[PDB]
Design an enzyme around this catalytic site. Sequence first.
Site, PDB file in Angstrom:
ATOM      1  CG  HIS A  33       0.096   5.816   9.983  1.00  0.00           C
ATOM      2  ND1 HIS A  33      -0.858   5.136   9.886  1.00  0.00           N
ATOM      3  CD2 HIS A  33       0.450   6.747   8.894  1.00  0.00           C
ATOM      4  CE1 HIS A  33      -1.358   5.346   8.692  1.00  0.00           C
ATOM      5  NE2 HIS A  33      -0.458   6.209   8.189  1.00  0.00           N
ATOM      6  N   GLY A  39      -0.140   9.152   1.207  1.00  0.00           N
ATOM      7  CA  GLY A  39      -1.070  10.372   1.660  1.00  0.00           C
ATOM      8  C   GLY A  39      -2.557   9.954   1.550  1.00  0.00           C
ATOM      9  CB  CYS A  81      -3.077   7.063   5.727  1.00  0.00           C
ATOM     10  SG  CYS A  81      -1.750   6.077   4.909  1.00  0.00           S
TER      11      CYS A  81
HETATM   12  C1  LIG Z   1       2.171   4.904   5.697  1.00  0.00           C
HETATM   13  C2  LIG Z   1       2.402   3.462   5.253  1.00  0.00           C
HETATM   14  C3  LIG Z   1       1.618   2.903   4.285  1.00  0.00           C
HETATM   15  O1  LIG Z   1       1.223   1.958   3.964  1.00  0.00           O
HETATM   16  N1  LIG Z   1       0.996   3.859   3.499  1.00  0.00           N
HETATM   17  C4  LIG Z   1       0.394   3.971   2.350  1.00  0.00           C
HETATM   18  C5  LIG Z   1      -1.211   3.576   2.559  1.00  0.00           C
HETATM   19  N2  LIG Z   1      -1.942   3.415   1.064  1.00  0.00           N
HETATM   20  C6  LIG Z   1      -1.276   3.408   0.102  1.00  0.00           C
HETATM   21  C7  LIG Z   1       0.238   3.511  -0.068  1.00  0.00           C
HETATM   22  C8  LIG Z   1       0.753   3.564  -1.429  1.00  0.00           C
HETATM   23  C9  LIG Z   1       2.066   4.000  -1.420  1.00  0.00           C
HETATM   24  C10 LIG Z   1       2.841   4.158  -0.217  1.00  0.00           C
HETATM   25  C11 LIG Z   1       2.557   4.209   0.948  1.00  0.00           C
HETATM   26  C12 LIG Z   1       0.901   3.977   1.094  1.00  0.00           C
HETATM   27  C13 LIG Z   1       3.863   3.455   4.605  1.00  0.00           C
HETATM   28  C14 LIG Z   1       4.987   2.816   5.490  1.00  0.00           C
HETATM   29  O2  LIG Z   1       4.715   1.491   6.214  1.00  0.00           O
HETATM   30  C15 LIG Z   1       3.587   1.675   6.962  1.00  0.00           C
HETATM   31  C16 LIG Z   1       3.065   0.641   7.841  1.00  0.00           C
HETATM   32  C17 LIG Z   1       1.824   0.764   8.572  1.00  0.00           C
HETATM   33  C18 LIG Z   1       1.098   1.416   8.354  1.00  0.00           C
HETATM   34 CL1  LIG Z   1      -0.159   1.685   9.374  1.00  0.00          CL
HETATM   35  C19 LIG Z   1       1.273   2.499   7.319  1.00  0.00           C
HETATM   36  C20 LIG Z   1       2.348   2.568   6.346  1.00  0.00           C
END
Ligand SMILES: C[C@@]1(C(=O)Nc2cncc3ccccc23)CCOc2ccc(Cl)cc21
Lengths: 304, 304
Positions: free
Chosen positions: B41, B143, B145
């Site tokens: 992603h 961020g 990820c």
């Molecule tokens: C990139 C995103 C996400 O979950 N990321 C994050 C990962 N960790 C902590 C988070 C804390 C606060 C904000 C986002 C977080 C956001 C959009 O929905 C999605 C949907 C699927 C996937 Cl594979 C990633 C994501």
Amino acid sequence: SGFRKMAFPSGKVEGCMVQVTCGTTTLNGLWLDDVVYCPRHVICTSEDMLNPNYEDLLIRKSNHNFLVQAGNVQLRVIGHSMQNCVLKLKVDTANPKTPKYKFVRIQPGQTFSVLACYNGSPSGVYQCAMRPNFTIKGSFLNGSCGSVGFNIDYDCVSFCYMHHMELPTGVHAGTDLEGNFYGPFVDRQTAQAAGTDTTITVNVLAWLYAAVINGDRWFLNRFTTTLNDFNLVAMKYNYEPLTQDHVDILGPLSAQTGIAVLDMCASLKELLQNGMNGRTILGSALLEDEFTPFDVVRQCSGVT
Amino acid sequence: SGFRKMAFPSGKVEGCMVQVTCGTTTLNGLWLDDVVYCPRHVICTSEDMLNPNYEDLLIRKSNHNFLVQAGNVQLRVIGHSMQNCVLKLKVDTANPKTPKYKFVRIQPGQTFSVLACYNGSPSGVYQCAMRPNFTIKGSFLNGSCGSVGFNIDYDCVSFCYMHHMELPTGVHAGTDLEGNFYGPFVDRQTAQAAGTDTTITVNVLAWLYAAVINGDRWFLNRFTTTLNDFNLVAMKYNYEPLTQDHVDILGPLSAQTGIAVLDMCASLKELLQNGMNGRTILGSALLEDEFTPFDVVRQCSGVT
Ligand SMILES: C[C@@]1(C(=O)Nc2cncc3ccccc23)CCOc2ccc(Cl)cc21
Ligand SMILES: C[C@@]1(C(=O)Nc2cncc3ccccc23)CCOc2ccc(Cl)cc21
């Protein structure tokens, strides 16, 4: 989201760990520049620990009696001195992995990470706090002496603790990097009991703010209190008195959540009086006090 | 003595963290040999996340659209491929700090350390477990990820997790290093709810053994039980069923303490039925399940 007991990345400190042996005693040393710091009881046998005269024992030791090994290579010792309860062993080689560093003496209530080591090798990293009775609740076995506690600010490691001793109660005592013990502890195997281990109130409040930020809000009530009224309750529950300095330090968390510090104090007062009633806060059934307000902001903002 | 939620020293993994940017998205990557692994992603905008066709989105990307920065220096991308939910970016330079490593897919109940990172820089390290519902209870912000989970056996890093997502419930989901998600999670911003988060029984028992080893013995009772009788209670309390494989795995802890596994099961049965009554075990008012039997032995023996 989520809130964990998080330690600093340990790499910068792993690069400084060495093994120090004197006679038959082996512990850990911290190699920074051309000096290796270690507990002075590296010169003692188990029998010497009962009543050691460190100055007298150190007279029988020369530079070549201190064996310092970094990884699997031997460092040459060209000088030795005792500063309070630590030995400083001057070596002929500066540690190529020396990070930017400072030696700091922390106050009770402050947190730090510990890199537990054995034979100069890292076993693990965990977060703890200097208790109000100047002990730490660590995880240390025989041979862990000389393991260090530290904080990191971007690229500067502030070393604040060196492990020396386990008290009969399973709690730990040590020194700053100048060799001065935290609290009244002495490096001798004699009856040393710790004082009252009170709860670090300002840290509990910071962790309640962390809980609100991360969604756990059940404990918020309709009440407020005053510093003096809260402190009457805190004293009854062996909590440290909260001062206006602590209220000031909780200012950023109060602004982030919109919850006035004294309203959070009133929520904490009710939790002390009523208990948790089988409920949890941030996955804990006790009020956590080993996160400072700075730790909560750092973890909740992602400082690297 | 003492027992802490201890993470592995993170240095070997800090040496592998890089920043990966594609378009306007930036996350973390893991650089091992001449390959950078990161969540696929990284190619998505926030709008693409609602319904992404990764194969189609990846067609619009070339090697030069993936910016990889290690420390403050740019790596040259000479190839890219998608394996399940991860991208593998081939770079022209092998990571000089690549440790000995393996990619492992862990089972629920197993623990690992996480090095939380932002912009390719480490923020902290903590210990967690793969829950029975295949989520992890981490501490991750936007961020984070591409931050990874790992275990270390002397000098070999076994990478087991790469962070991808936060569910609406504040729990976390990710993949192994082959890009396969743990559990049924998909990398799309859609309604994904976690199943029952049951308690890892074999880990609770290991931690009760850790408590006995470290002196906390109040909970030991005069009773024993059978696997079937214990499991009737465990099911009632949303605990995982204990098998003879788990009893076998607790053999070393049973031998160290002299407490038969089924007697410890009977102590745990009484704790579930009676509660803690305001008491604590290893400083906790809940039964801890994120220490495996291997973790307890390792921490209690000082493996480096
Ligand atoms: C990139 C995103 C996400 O979950 N990321 C994050 C990962 N960790 C902590 C988070 C804390 C606060 C904000 C986002 C977080 C956001 C959009 O929905 C999605 C949907 C699927 C996937 Cl594979 C990633 C994501
Ligand atoms: C060296 C020793 C000790 O406490 N060390 C240890 C430090 N940490 C964890 C321990 C776990 C188990 C066994 C010893 C531990 C033992 C003798 O009495 C003393 C007395 C004073 C001092 Cl400054 C050190 C010591």
